[model samples]
Target: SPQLEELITKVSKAHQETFPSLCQLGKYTTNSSADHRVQLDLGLWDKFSELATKCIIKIVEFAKRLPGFTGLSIADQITLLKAACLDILMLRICTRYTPEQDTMTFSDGLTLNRTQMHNAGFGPLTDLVFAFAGQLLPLEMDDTETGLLSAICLICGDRMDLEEPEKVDKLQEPLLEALRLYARRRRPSQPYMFPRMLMKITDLRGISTKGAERAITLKMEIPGPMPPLIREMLE
Candidate 1:
């Protein structure tokens, strides 16, 4: 029990250090291309993509902090990070959703409304993402649960091209245990919450898949090339 408590603390600290709370962020907005159209708004994309790249860096930082992550092979490390970067990114942003304002805040406090999210390279995936954020509201997950869930998402073994998937799965075992115990321990009455959190990984993967597809079309719309890190994550 003490070990699980330490694991939860480490995970929660890792997440908080890497990803700041929306409340801590000084919210900023962009007026670039208010109306949603088929065309991409390059200005908004520039900001969005920049934010995304930074988030990817934070994800790398978070991954490295996970116990046993650095013990994996270098190639497997890269593989896992690339595979789960978008998923973690989606999860992080969705956690920052503001239902009353209908907005999602970035790590740096850059918040975007539904229309602005569409303009910022989300394209058709905007509403789906917003809907996902809305759904997360009812679950009332805490920082520890989110951190453990994110660890599970990143340390997954089923990702394609993994050189040591079995090893990855081995590391994931503790994370899963930590999440289940922590989630159940936190909400004694809500026994189903743990399962619901696991289900979110599936939803995140679906959204990230569409996000990758959106990137393909987005590449054609933006004048310049995608950021190198973001491109690497997609491919």
Candidate 2:
């Protein structure tokens, strides 16, 4: 129990350190001129893209700190980060969401209205992305669950590219158990919530797939290519 508690504590702290709470993020506004852009507003996309790359590094850092994560092969680490970075990004923004405003704020505190979110990068799938955020509210996952779920997403042994699938699976088991224990402690009556949250991984993956599609399609709308770091994450 003590070990599990430590896992929760460290992951919770990692989540906070890796990503700023919405209130702590720098709030910014876009201009009317940005509306004329086709897929992504260059200014907003630049800021958003920069924030994403920083968060990716944070995710990698957090993963390295997870018990036994660093024990895996370095190539497996890169493979895991490549697979899960967008999923983590999606989860981070979805958690930062403002349901009432129907908006998702970025780490820099750029609060975009639904329309602005579309104009910034989401494009045609903006509403679907917002809808995914809306569904997450009912789960009421705290930072611990969020962090563990992110770990589960990242350490999947089934990613098809890992050299040490057995090792990764071994690392993932503790995180899975930690999440189950944490969820039950928080809500004993709602035993179903654990499975529900696990199901959400598929949903998150689906939404992130759309996010990738949006990234590619938005290329034609912008003046130049996507930010270099963003291309790194995508590839």
Candidate 3:
């Protein structure tokens, strides 16, 4: 139990250091055009894409800090990070959702409304992402829970092309245990909350699939290529 407590603390600290809490952010807005049509606002895209690139770096840092993550084969580590980066990114932003304002904030406090999100290259996927964020509101997950979930998502063993999947699963086991114990202790009556949090992984994968497709289309819309890191992760 003492070890599990330590694991939970580490995961919580990793998440907090890499991703700022919504209230901690300053919450700046963009004035870019917010039309209903499926057109990219170059200005918003620039800002959003930049934020995304930075986020990916933060995700990589978060992965390295996860207990036993670096012990995996280098190839397996890269494989897991690429596979789950988008899912974690989606989860991270959705956690920052502000229902009162109908906006999602980035690490640097850049907040975009649903309409602005649409203009920022999410386009048709914007509404779906917002809906997912709305659903997450009821769960009320905190930084530690979010961090542990992210670790589980990243260190998954089922992802294709893993060199040491069994090893990956071995690492994931402790993360699962940590989350189960932590979530239950945090909310004694909400026994279902743990399962519900795990289920969001499925939803995140679904959205990230659309997100990959959107990236393909997004490439054509932008005057320049996708940022190097973003291109690497998506492809």
Candidate 4:
């Protein structure tokens, strides 16, 4: 126990659901009548901070996985997780939806129209939707599984008679397919293929374990209530 993390996975809880609050903040530029409304988002600053803390906990989970992945000397596996964490967090914070301002701005101060967001970060589409894609990592699903799931999410809205579904699944499908193809292309060359988990669907599914589930739910969620997508998957 002294050598590793044997903790029972109870870390940050309230922080994961930072979305609704961030969205509540609305369009915070230099000045606006929405100032009071924006302050509402600030109320959850503590929660946002805690949510970030929970994201850090994901790193810990990756470290403590069976066979002790952290024990491995592989640099790629370590690099992939580190690179995606912050980006994912940003997406989670922004997608909460602001009725007043009608926009979701990033921590970097980049304000996006709804269409812009759907293109770059969260949406029911593909070639974009970083949040949807990033969140998949913590789940530990492997290559094909992640692809299939994202495809399902992007495509289902249209097929199932949901609202305004379009070329999303088809768009997103390529990203997932490319991920798989890139791995295969490298198979003969890289051999061991670092971060092999991303190369498979099950690794993605593996991340949905109770601990991973907690890590995700704690950081991702709309403010007032759960959306169908989250409810469908996480619930």
Candidate 5:
């Protein structure tokens, strides 16, 4: 009962938030900028970053509730958090990016992105999401729990402010990138890195709905622009 409730709650929360238009992408008469570059609205990112932190903490709680988590070393708990935090946050927040201001605001008020952002002194906001995920390793979780958690985190879909259905489909590349980057920085052997983890996670979770959704995102981002011959060969 708890499991179904949790899954339903997460899904319902996500669906409601996603299908709306926060800022209509038409002409804004007041602002003058000649570059015509896509500007990210920091406000949305700020919302997402804060929300991300909350979700990660929720995950920590979830871990604690599960079997054997409390017995883990502090370092190991932190490690698990660190590994999963950014992946979860990115999965949630990237869906909230507001292109209007050219800002990638986190769930916190803090905001910025690489296109026009400086990395030097932005403090912990620029990268903390993943850092927090990495902190989770210190918590104790079996392989199945860990894998299930990762699957749950990704599909939560809580950040729908930036939620264009098409745009939502576009996050797969960077999401995988975030996972890969976190996995790379991790000190353990290569076995735990993502795409690799995906094999395990996917199998445990079932390649059903979430897997289908993942496929949709990949379809959106992947280069399917084939030469007619190439397309024929692949198909």
Candidate 6:
């Protein structure tokens, strides 16, 4: 019992270290809002695109460090990363939400106001994304819960491309169990929060779907190609 708990704890801590919370990324600047709204052109998309790549690499690293993730066949590992990177990226950015200010900060401490979010590429989906972030506030998930939830998302066998679906599914089971156990331990008074957190994963899937659509439109709207890493992720 102690060994299993210790492994989960170590994996959770390692995850946090690889993909730190937004607050842990850098200090939030006092002037978070941009003066005006501008369309996401080459200039802004390049900046936003780079952030996506960084987050993707962190997700990969996070997966690699998890106790059993690397034990999977390499094909399965890549398949999981391809399927889950955007989902985890959505969670990563959403968790950094500043509810009071109606803004989201990135890993670089480059905070963007609502309009700036539109300019940075959210466009029509800016309000929707922010709305999702606002709703996430009620779950009140801490870093450990968030990290375990992410691991659950990553290891699921539901994705069509999994090389060894059963193996991935097996890995996912404990993560699901671990998250529920940890969530109850953290908020015994609010057991519903655990189920609610799972629901948020579904909601995040919707956001990622739209995010991919936005990426397509971005390719058409921008003067040049999307960044190589971004293209790789979206592909």
Specify the highest-lDDT model's number: 3
CA shift at 133, candidate 3, in angstroms?
A: 0.4
* Model 6 pairs whose backbones collide: none
Number of the candidate with higher lDDT, 1 or 6: 1
Shift of residue 123 alpha carbon in model 4, Å: 18
Winner of 3 and 6 under lDDT: 3
lDDT of 3 by residue, 1-235 (tens): 8998999999999999999999898978777785454588899899999999999999999999999999999999889989999999999999989998888899888888888888989987988999999999899999999999999999999999999899999999999999999999999899999999999999999999999999988888999998999987986
Q: Which residue pairs clash within candidate 1? A: none
Model 3, runs deviating above 4 Å: 35-38
- Least accurate 10 contiguous residues by lDDT in model 1: 31-40
Q: TM-scores, in order shown?
A: 0.97, 0.93, 0.98, 0.26, 0.30, 0.93
Ranked by TM-score, the better of candidates 2 and 4 is 2
CA-only RMSD, every prediction: 1.1, 1.9, 1.0, 18.8, 19.9, 2.0
lDDT (10s digit) by residue, model 2, range 1-235: 8998998898888878877787787777666334443555667666666777788778888898888888889999888888888988888888988887766777767787777777667789878878888899999988888989998999899886789999999989989999999999999999998999999899988988888888888887777887776787788
* lDDT, model 3, position 221: 90
TM match of model 5 to true structure = 0.30
Which is better, 4 or 5, measured by lDDT? 5
For all candidates, the clash counts are 0, 1, 0, 20, 48, 0
lDDT of each: 0.90, 0.83, 0.92, 0.35, 0.37, 0.80
The superposed Cα distance between candidate 3 and the true structure at residue 109, in angstroms, equals 0.9
Clashing pairs in 2: 26-109
TM-score of 2: 0.93
| Steric clash pairs (candidate 3) | none
Report the C-alpha displacement of residue 162, candidate 6, in angstroms. 1.2
> Tens digits of per-residue lDDT for model 5 on 1-235?
4644454334333332331222322322112222332333343323333444455565555544433334544544444444344454343333334445544443333444433222211222333333322333343232333434453444322333322323323323333443444454453465464554555333333322332343244334333431232122122
Top TM-score model: 3
